[PDB]
Amino acid sequence: HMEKLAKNKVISIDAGRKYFTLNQLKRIVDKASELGYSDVHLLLGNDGLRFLLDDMTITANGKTYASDDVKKAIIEGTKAYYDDPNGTALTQAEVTELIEYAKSKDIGLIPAINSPGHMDAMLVAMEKLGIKNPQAHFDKVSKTTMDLKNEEAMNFVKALIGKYMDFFAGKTKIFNFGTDEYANDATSAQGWYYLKWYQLYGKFAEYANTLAAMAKERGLQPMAFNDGFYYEDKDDVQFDKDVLISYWSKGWWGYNLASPQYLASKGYKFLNTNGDWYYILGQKPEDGGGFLKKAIENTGKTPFNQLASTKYPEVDLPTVGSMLSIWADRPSAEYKEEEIFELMTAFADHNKDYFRANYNALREELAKIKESLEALDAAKTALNYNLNRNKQAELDTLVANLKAALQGL
Ligand SMILES: [Mg+2]
Ligand SMILES: [Mg+2]
Ligand SMILES: [Mg+2]
Ligand SMILES: [Mg+2]
Ligand SMILES: [Mg+2]
Numbered sequence: 001h002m003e004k005l006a007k008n009k010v011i012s013i014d015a016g017r018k019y020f021t022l023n024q025l026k027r028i029v030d031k032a033s034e035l036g037y038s039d040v041h042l043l044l045g046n047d048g049l050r051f052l053l054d055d056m057t058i059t060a061n062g063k064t065y066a067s068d069d070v071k072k073a074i075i076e077g078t079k080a081y082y083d084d085p086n087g088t089a090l091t092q093a094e095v096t097e098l099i100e101y102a103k104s105k106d107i108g109l110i111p112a113i114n115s116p117g118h119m120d121a122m123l124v125a126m127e128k129l130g131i132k133n134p135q136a137h138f139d140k141v142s143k144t145t146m147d148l149k150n151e152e153a154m155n156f157v158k159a160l161i162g163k164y165m166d167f168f169a170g171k172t173k174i175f176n177f178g179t180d181e182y183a184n185d186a187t188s189a190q191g192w193y194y195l196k197w198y199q200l201y202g203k204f205a206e207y208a209n210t211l212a213a214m215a216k217e218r219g220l221q222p223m224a225f226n227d228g229f230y231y232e233d234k235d236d237v238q239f240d241k242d243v244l245i246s247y248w249s250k251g252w253w254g255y256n257l258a259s260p261q262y263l264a265s266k267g268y269k270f271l272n273t274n275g276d277w278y279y280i281l282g283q284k285p286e287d288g289g290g291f292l293k294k295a296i297e298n299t300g301k302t303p304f305n306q307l308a309s310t311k312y313p314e315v316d317l318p319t320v321g322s323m324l325s326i327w328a329d330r331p332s333a334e335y336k337e338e339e340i341f342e343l344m345t346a347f348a349d350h351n352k353d354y355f356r357a358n359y360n361a362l363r364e365e366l367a368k369i370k371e372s373l374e375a376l377d378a379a380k381t382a383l384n385y386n387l388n389r390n391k392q393a394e395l396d397t398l399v400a401n402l403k404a405a406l407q408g409l
Contacts (some may be wrong), residue, residue, distance in 0.1 A: 004042065004354045005388060008271060008321025011344055016046025018281070018331035019087040022094040026101055033105035034390045035348040036078075036355030040102060041176070041323055044090070045113035045164075047295040048078040048331070050389045053167055061072070065129055070160075081329045091376035092167070099171050105188035106359070110174045110223065113164050115157055116146040116207060117181030117191070122160070126153055138194050148203045162214055169218040174244065177211040180225035188321040190254060192231045192261035204228060205237045205272040212240035223271070229263060232256040241267050248273040248324065250309035264317045272322040275304055276302040279326050279343055282333025290327065292339055299324070299347040304354055322354075352389035359385070362399045365406065372409045379405040 011032050013020065020028075027042055044051035056070040078088055097111050115122070117134075120143055126134040134153035136145040139406050146153050161177065168175055182191035182204060195201040208228055215222040223244040231240060245268045251257040260270065275296035278290030285291050304322055306312035324347050325339055348355040362383065369376075379402040 001353070002386075004357055005386065007319070007354060008039055009037040009351075009355055010041045010271065010321065010323035011037055011340075012041035012043070012323050013324035014043050014046055014272070014296065014326060014328040015050055015090070015120070016043040016048055016112070016328075016337065017082065018129065018328035019050055019084040019089075020335070021087065022090065022098060023224070024335070024337070025098055027337065028340070029098070029102045029105060029107050030360070032109050032356050034360055035344055037107065037344070037348070038194060038321070038356075039108040040111050041110040041112065041325075042098075042178075043091060043112040043114065045115070045122070046094075046118050046178070047114075047120045047136070048081045049074050049119075049125070050086075050087075050089045051076060051095060051111075051113075051115075052089045052091060053056075053163070056157060056163070058159050058163065060159040060202065061152050063168060063290040068159075069129060070125070073128040074121060076128055077121035077206045077290065080124045081120040085329060095167075096171075105363075106125075108174075109172050110165070110176060111168050111172060112178060112223075112274035113161055113162060114178030114180065115211070115242075116148065116178075116179065116204070117183070118144060118178060119146060119157075120144050122146070122157060126156055129156075134349070136183040136186060138183055138186040139188065140186050142183040143371075144185050144193070145181065145183035148200055148207060148277060152345075154207070158210065158214070165214060165218045165220060173221055174223050175215045175220040176223040176246065177208075177215065177226045178225060179208050179211070181227060192228070192257075193254070196231070201231065202237050205239055208243075209240045212243050216242060225273075226260075226263065229260040230266065232264040233258055235266075239266075242271055244271055244320065246273045246396050247307050248278075248325075253339055258316060260310055260317055261315065270307060270317065270319045272305065272307055272319045273325060274298075274302055274308050274322070275325040276304060276308070277322075277343075277347065279339070280329045280333075281335055295343055296346045299343070300350045304351045328357075348389055355389040357387040357389055357392050357395045359395070362402070364396070365399055366401050367407060376402075376405040376409060 056069050057067040102109050110230040123134050131152050136142040136147045184191045187194045213221040226245050226247045247270045279295040280290045303312040303406040
């Protein structure tokens with residue numbers, strides 16, 4: 001059916017907290033293409049900022065920050081969060097190659113540059129560039145979140161995100177600006193309650209609305225996590241309606257995030273990023289949370305269309321697709337490719353009607369191209385590009401016929 005295959009099947013990789021090589025990411029892309037995924041969600045800004053453009057010149061606050069100054073500041077900020085021995089940041093040439101490599105396998109890339117929360121690297125970077133006190137300050141000075149009242153910091157980050165958006169414009173369909181937290185380290189995980197207390201929640205919305213307008217103007221579909229949108233189902237503060245919502249959870253006790261029902265009533269489309277499918281690198285059964293055993297179990301237990309805090313199909317809210325997420329909460333933990341591959345395969349195997357068939361063997365065979373020309377032409381026409389994961393044997397036969405016609409030219 002066209003509807004199921006039209007939906008997004010996304011694997012999310014936390015390459016913000018932890019470094020991934022181009023080859024590691026290429027191998028994730030190829031495995032995603034094999035299993036029938038449509039997109040790779042790649043966090044590049046998440047705590048650490050692990051992506052540098054060739055030109056990092058920034059214009060904000062009536063002055064310009066030299067490209068080499070910005071690069072050096074960001075590298076110092078990212079190493080300040082976590083000095084990864086595997087590497088610090090991906091280059092423009094590496095990300096450009098990754099986008100083109102993914103495109104050749106019908107895989108989209110969804111970049112994520114997080115703010116105002118989860119931006120440890122940007123905060124230190126701004127300090128090195130002469131921007132004093134960029135951090136939010138509540139129970140203590142945050143190490144993760146920008147102060148919304150600091151114009152100097154706000155103007156720089158907007159300009160910085162703009163430059164990242166300029167690069168992804170015309171290369172990717174979607175840009176994720178995050179907005180998933182506000183100084184949870186400085187509020188005992190009560191960032192939204194603190195924004196409300198200090199009447200700065202209107203200022204948060206203004207920042208999120210700006211980022212959404214920045215994405216749309218540059219031809220990018222705006223994307224954000226649900227956390228900041230219409231907190232506690234209240235609408236005295238309005239948000240941009242065009243944002244694709246990465247819904248992952250309704251929160252916990254004292255963390256009253258908007259329900260999927262309420263956000264759906266505002267007209268929001270969801271990318272189902274259910275927290276049930278979460279795997280944090282190195283997480284074990286005794287730690288609780290997103291360990292590998294539970295994540296693999298949940299790919300079967302939690303329905304593809306089930307939004308967090310809802311029972312499916314009882315509550316059936318329209319989604320554009322689903323996203324399984326890999327996190328690197330402690331980036332020092334070892335990335336084991338096969339663990340991610342097993343979790344990716346499990347999600348595809350439980351949902352064979354949503355995921356497409358493996359078209360890698362078919363692409364290899366087409367790269368190798370007078371009753372002989374009639375036979376080759378007939379097998380080429382017989383090819384079916386619309387087969388899901390349930391029909392691999394059906395596709396394999398069609399590829400085998402193309403092989404027989406090609407070996408008899
Ligand atoms: Mg302090
Ligand atoms: Mg307010
Ligand atoms: Mg739009
Ligand atoms: Mg998920
Ligand atoms: Mg490692």
